[PDB]
Design an enzyme around this catalytic site. Structure first.
Site, PDB file in Angstrom:
ATOM      1  N   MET A  24       0.822  -1.312   0.240  1.00 46.68           N
ATOM      2  CA  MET A  24       0.340   0.126  -0.092  1.00 46.68           C
ATOM      3  C   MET A  24       0.916   0.824   0.162  1.00 46.68           C
ATOM      4  SD  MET A  24      -3.402  -0.979   2.049  1.00 46.68           S
ATOM      5  CE  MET A  24      -4.854  -1.244   0.763  1.00 46.68           C
ATOM      6  N   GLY A  25       2.461   0.894  -0.456  1.00 45.34           N
ATOM      7  CA  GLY A  25       2.767   2.524  -0.601  1.00 45.34           C
ATOM      8  C   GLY A  25       3.425   3.007   1.056  1.00 45.34           C
ATOM      9  N   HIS A  77       8.832   1.209   3.486  1.00 42.50           N
ATOM     10  CA  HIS A  77      10.058   1.191   4.475  1.00 42.50           C
ATOM     11  C   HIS A  77      10.907  -0.378   4.404  1.00 42.50           C
ATOM     12  CE1 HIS A  77       7.827  -1.305   6.418  1.00 42.50           C
ATOM     13  NE2 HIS A  77       6.267  -0.969   7.115  1.00 42.50           N
ATOM     14  N   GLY A 108      11.155  -3.211   5.792  1.00 47.49           N
ATOM     15  CA  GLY A 108      10.235  -4.271   6.042  1.00 47.49           C
ATOM     16  C   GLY A 108      10.197  -4.465   4.595  1.00 47.49           C
ATOM     17  N   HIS A 109       9.410  -3.769   4.099  1.00 38.15           N
ATOM     18  CA  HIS A 109       8.487  -3.669   2.837  1.00 38.15           C
ATOM     19  C   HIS A 109       9.707  -4.741   1.460  1.00 38.15           C
ATOM     20  CE1 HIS A 109       5.447  -1.070   4.061  1.00 38.15           C
ATOM     21  NE2 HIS A 109       4.967  -1.571   4.305  1.00 38.15           N
ATOM     22  N   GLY A 156       4.455 -10.642   4.539  1.00 40.00           N
ATOM     23  CA  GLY A 156       5.317 -10.158   5.465  1.00 40.00           C
ATOM     24  C   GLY A 156       4.239 -11.429   7.051  1.00 40.00           C
ATOM     25  N   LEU A 216       9.539  -3.663  12.051  1.00 34.82           N
ATOM     26  CA  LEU A 216       8.907  -2.536  11.930  1.00 34.82           C
ATOM     27  C   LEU A 216       8.169  -2.261  11.571  1.00 34.82           C
ATOM     28  CD1 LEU A 216      12.794  -2.679   9.624  1.00 34.82           C
ATOM     29  CD2 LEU A 216      11.850  -1.500  12.008  1.00 34.82           C
ATOM     30  N   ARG A 242       2.857   1.981  11.359  1.00 33.36           N
ATOM     31  CA  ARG A 242       2.145   2.541  12.693  1.00 33.36           C
ATOM     32  C   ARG A 242       3.387   2.852  13.287  1.00 33.36           C
TER      33      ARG A 242
HETATM   34  N1  ANP Z   1       8.753  -5.536   9.616  1.00 37.36           N
HETATM   35  C1  ANP Z   1       7.787  -6.368   8.330  1.00 37.36           C
HETATM   36  N2  ANP Z   1       8.854  -6.915   8.789  1.00 37.36           N
HETATM   37  C2  ANP Z   1       8.364  -8.312   7.014  1.00 37.36           C
HETATM   38  N3  ANP Z   1       7.016  -7.625   5.967  1.00 37.36           N
HETATM   39  C3  ANP Z   1       7.076  -7.035   6.464  1.00 37.36           C
HETATM   40  C4  ANP Z   1       6.973  -5.784   7.815  1.00 37.36           C
HETATM   41  N4  ANP Z   1       5.557  -4.760   7.757  1.00 37.36           N
HETATM   42  C5  ANP Z   1       5.069  -4.916   7.028  1.00 37.36           C
HETATM   43  N5  ANP Z   1       5.285  -6.363   6.426  1.00 37.36           N
HETATM   44  C6  ANP Z   1       4.897  -7.417   4.557  1.00 37.36           C
HETATM   45  O1  ANP Z   1       4.909  -5.943   3.532  1.00 37.36           O
HETATM   46  C7  ANP Z   1       3.360  -5.874   3.501  1.00 37.36           C
HETATM   47  C8  ANP Z   1       3.021  -4.697   3.747  1.00 37.36           C
HETATM   48  O2  ANP Z   1       1.507  -4.420   3.157  1.00 37.36           O
HETATM   49  P1  ANP Z   1       1.148  -2.745   3.773  1.00 37.36           P
HETATM   50  O3  ANP Z   1      -0.323  -2.877   4.744  1.00 37.36           O
HETATM   51  O4  ANP Z   1       1.009  -1.891   2.399  1.00 37.36           O
HETATM   52  O5  ANP Z   1       2.379  -2.416   5.281  1.00 37.36           O
HETATM   53  P2  ANP Z   1       2.291  -2.032   6.789  1.00 37.36           P
HETATM   54  O6  ANP Z   1       3.451  -1.781   7.267  1.00 37.36           O
HETATM   55  O7  ANP Z   1       2.016  -3.643   7.474  1.00 37.36           O
HETATM   56  N6  ANP Z   1       1.097  -0.729   6.674  1.00 37.36           N
HETATM   57  P3  ANP Z   1       0.520   0.186   8.949  1.00 37.36           P
HETATM   58  O8  ANP Z   1      -0.980  -0.784   8.407  1.00 37.36           O
HETATM   59  O9  ANP Z   1       0.981   0.844   8.829  1.00 37.36           O
HETATM   60  O10 ANP Z   1       1.390  -1.610   9.488  1.00 37.36           O
HETATM   61  C9  ANP Z   1       2.870  -7.306   3.616  1.00 37.36           C
HETATM   62  O11 ANP Z   1       2.914  -8.435   3.041  1.00 37.36           O
HETATM   63  C10 ANP Z   1       3.728  -7.318   5.387  1.00 37.36           C
HETATM   64  O12 ANP Z   1       3.261  -8.752   6.126  1.00 37.36           O
END
Ligand code: ANP
Ligand code: ANP
Ligand code: MG
Lengths: 266, 271
Positions: free
Chosen positions: A27-28, A31, A33-34, A135, A172, A175
């Site tokens: 979803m853009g 960071h 973690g992505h 993730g 990471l 949030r």
């Molecule tokens: N710290 C992390 N380590 C590994 N994968 C991650 C991490 N944070 C997010 N992801 C993965 O990357 C994708 C994230 O999509 P997205 O919702 O856009 O990020 P997000 O960080 O989860 N948004 P948020 O609700 O603010 O945490 C999903 O497949 C998550 O499982």
């Protein structure tokens, strides 16, 4: 080099006459973690598609997002607008998860995992990937996607990627930017309490409910507002049964108004 | 030339080398109505897959060789005949394609869960066969609308080709369930299409009392021995409720002679 496709038609035109495709839906507001997902995707296919879409059914930084992906060797950034994916107002046909959608995070996010399963199915039918990376931080999301992939016969390898963390253990997540200085120093206790549950399970612990309450009690006493701490079967999030060896502990708790989630596989 | 393939893995392996595919999903027991779909599919692609598959727990609430024989003459390249466990390995279907309220209207009112199961098994077959073109019969008009809907809403890159209903000499819509009709019931069965056509004729002649036409057809079939589920005038294609001035209409009916439930419909284009 990198390309920014905005239409379904252009995405499909590019994708035909390409070989193996690894796909990362996001979803853009990208960071580190992505990028763990993107890096793992590039180790499984030469052509990586990263979608950036915000889904009205479940913070735009488009230029800064695509520069980060460029440096990771991504082939295509698919960023359609809302009307491209939802040309009508409503989404009439939805992928309906089982009761899992109303458990854990779903209990306080009704309709959320239905929207995830639907938009991921749409994206799957648009990109036609061979591999898709998700993730493990969002474990329930991962179970829903693995489940729909199996039950709907999507010929797609679902690759879980490990949660990237800060030095102090905090998962990471975008949030994390909401936390105050004080709350950020306290935020690592979530993962600490999950690890100690996994250790109790490792050291022969049998009382699932006792362990969940203790972690919940420690968080509450330290100022958290606990939504749940639950031990469940790994991967599927089916109910944990006495004697199970592949488990996962999950929790969600609020520091102030920020809800944090994390999990540990034991 | 023609193959019978039973597993998803063998279907995918065959499909990978092949270019364009036209697809006809069926429940077997094939008749000329089905062959109409197969001929249409064969006009649009060199390689035609016909699937034969039932799962009475999920939707639907002659031997395979005899079916394969009818298809072998028609230029079909693959009969795909998986068993229940192949498509539903855990019996339970946890993730379902859920249609809108349409699934509870018309035949759906008398077939709880049916159109959800059709929507789900068609999506699964779409994801297995990966066709370019799929053929469906207008006799199951609501089913066709459900499949057009899920194809658009879930972005399946598949052309949906509707095929007109093949009928007996006396007008009766061809259907596998016609074999279960008594001698007397079969001779009465053509009244359903006849009344649908007389409704269409009233409409073509400017009739605006849609409710009254629906009732008269249902009362007449009831008076003739049928148990009527419904007769309804709807907007064509979308099956939205018909309104006074509508030009593109469809009349749909479902009614039972004894143990056998029959459906049919007639489309109307008003000037
Ligand atoms: N710290 C992390 N380590 C590994 N994968 C991650 C991490 N944070 C997010 N992801 C993965 O990357 C994708 C994230 O999509 P997205 O919702 O856009 O990020 P997000 O960080 O989860 N948004 P948020 O609700 O603010 O945490 C999903 O497949 C998550 O499982
Ligand atoms: N008379 C017909 N003319 C055209 N298409 C038809 C006809 N009968 C069935 N089809 C289509 O053939 C496909 C397979 O339908 P299927 O349910 O297997 O046949 P059926 O005769 O309706 N079976 P049943 O309800 O048990 O009698 C569907 O897309 C139907 O709409
Ligand atoms: Mg049949």
């Amino acid at each position: 080099h990198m390309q920014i496709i905005h239409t379904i038609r252009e995405l499909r035109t590019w994708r035909e006459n390409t070989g193996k495709v690894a796909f990362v839906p996001t979803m853009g507001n990208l960071h580190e973690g992505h990028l763990a997902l993107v890096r793992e995707a590039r180790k499984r296919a030469d052509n990586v598609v990263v979608s950036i879409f915000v889904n009205r059914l479940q913070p735009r930084t488009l230029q800064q997002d695509a520069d980060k992906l460029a440096a990771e060797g991504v082939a295509v950034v698919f960023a359609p607008d809302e009307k491209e994916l939802y040309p009508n107002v409503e989404q009439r046909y939805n992928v309906e998860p089982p009761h899992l959608q109303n458990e854990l995070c779903g209990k306080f996010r009704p309709g959320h995992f239905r929207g995830v399963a639907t938009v991921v199915s749409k994206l799957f039918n648009i990109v036609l990937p061979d591999v898709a990376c998700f993730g493990k931080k969002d474990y329930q999301q991962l179970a829903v996607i693995k489940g729909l992939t199996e039950d709907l016969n999507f010929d797609i390898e679902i690759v879980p990627v490990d949660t990237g963390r800060a030095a102090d253990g905090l998962a990471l997540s975008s949030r994390n930017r909401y936390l105050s200085v004080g709350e950020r120093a306290e935020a690592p206790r979530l993962y600490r309490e999950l690890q100690a549950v996994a250790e109790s399970l490792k050291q022969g612990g049998l009382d699932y409910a006792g362990l969940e309450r203790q972690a919940a009690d420690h968080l509450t006493a330290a100022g958290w507002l606990v939504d749940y701490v639950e031990i469940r079967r790994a991967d599927t999030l089916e109910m944990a049964r006495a004697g199970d060896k592949k488990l996962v502990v999950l929790a969600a708790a609020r520091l102030g108004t920020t809800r944090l989630i994390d999990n540990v596989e034991v």
